[PDB]
Amino acid sequence: VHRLAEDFDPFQDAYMADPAQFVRWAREQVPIFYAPKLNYWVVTRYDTIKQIFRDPVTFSPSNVLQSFAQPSAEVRQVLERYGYAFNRTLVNEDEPMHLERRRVLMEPFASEHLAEHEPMVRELVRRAVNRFIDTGRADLVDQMIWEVPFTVALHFLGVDDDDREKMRRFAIAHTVNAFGRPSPEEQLAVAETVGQFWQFCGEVLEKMRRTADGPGWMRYSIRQQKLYPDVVTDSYLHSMMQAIIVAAHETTVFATTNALKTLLEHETVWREICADPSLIPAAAEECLRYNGPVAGWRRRTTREVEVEGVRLPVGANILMVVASANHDSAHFDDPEFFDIGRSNASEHLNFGYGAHQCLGRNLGRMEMQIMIEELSRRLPHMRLAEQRFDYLHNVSFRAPRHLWVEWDPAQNPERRDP
Ligand code: HEM
């Protein structure tokens, strides 16, 4: 138990594939421990994690997007060449300004406004499945799930048709760079893309200011800046395109990939949702609890504070193993039961809790639900193919990189006889 704390290393297959099992020892008997390989304190229980999320002044989100790689002089030089001035934009932003900015920018995330995006999501998903449904073997990640949430994010922002086509090359992987230990080479490749995207978005922001009464979050926020000029700076608005894409893209990809893996691995449940699609919203919620995209999330203390009887110093790094909380028998009855009927499944912590709780969570849920319904209606007869599941190593987000499935196209429901 002393040994497991000293040896704690999340940069390995077992933490990525099943973090809740990997730390079950700690959830059961060691609710806080220091991990000297990380210089992080690690918490694993549902109520400890809710307590930390509940106080954003004591427990700052300043380290949420902090890379574990050693810092890069070449990275800084590339970003300064492009005039990069990305702000800490909501997810890792401190009080008091975070809640003031969330108050003025949150309206377009309301369920009533996200409802306008539903036809576009349905069309993207139908068009993606059309491109592979007649083949009989496909990787659901590379052949649909990767791209759909990137395009959805650009629609939520209000990016115009020509600009979305020019943005295809910016749909890169950010998870290892922000939450893991990228090589010097990967760090520099991401920096170059980020700087180029900063330049591209400066130009999009001028155009959006010319059509400020048009649709989407960016134009909403430009109109809010006119009402609250001392709350919304120009560089914060410039930062909002990247912030939303990072927030909305791989999160949703990982959630959907995991949900499909779990539903196909639990064949009786796949059969149930193929028979009764009204079960899909609740099923997607239990997928988030049982096999969610968030392994871990982070905070840094701003004052000495007692957590589980241990007084942490100022500036202490905390890893909250959200997947462990989501498997915690002290909150979830029979947590190893994958139960799509679970009434409290939405009490999972993949969207956080409290002041920074995910603003886009209902759009993420809608995308998951539409992708599951399209595949259960048009490919009920598919099955997971034999394959190895590989996870990129990082502290926060987990999903297999590929998800191969196979089926008989002649038995597709849209071709099958009555
Ligand atoms: C399944 C998909 C998603 C997951 C798992 C997810 C997860 C998260 C998490 C863990 C946080 C931090 C919560 C906290 O500290 O309490 C967060 C914040 C946020 N997410 Fe999401 N997210 C998802 C989808 C999206 C989408 C689709 C958007 C945009 C439309 C989005 C926008 C945001 C924003 C703007 C924040 C910052 C809120 C704040 O700090 O006040 N997310 N998300």
Residue numbers in the entry: 28 to 445
Question: What does the published report state?
Answer:
In the other class of self-sufficient P450s, CYP116 P450s contain an N-terminal heme domain fused to a phthalate dioxygenase-type reductase domain that consists of a NAD(P)H reductase domain and a [2Fe-2S] cluster-containing domain (ferredoxin) at the C-terminus. The electron transport chain of these P450s is NAD(P)H→FMN→[2Fe-2S]→heme. Notably, CYP116B46 from T. thermophilus is a highly potent and thermostable protein. A more recent report describes its activity in catalyzing region- and enatio-selective C-H-lactonizations of saturated fatty acids.
The heme domain is very similar to the recently reported N-terminal region of CYP116B46 (denoted CYP116B46-N), albeit a small structural difference is observed with Cα root-mean-square deviation, Cα RMSD, of 1.154 Å27. In particular, helix αB’, αE, αF, and αG in CYP116B5-N and CYP116B46-N adopt various conformations.
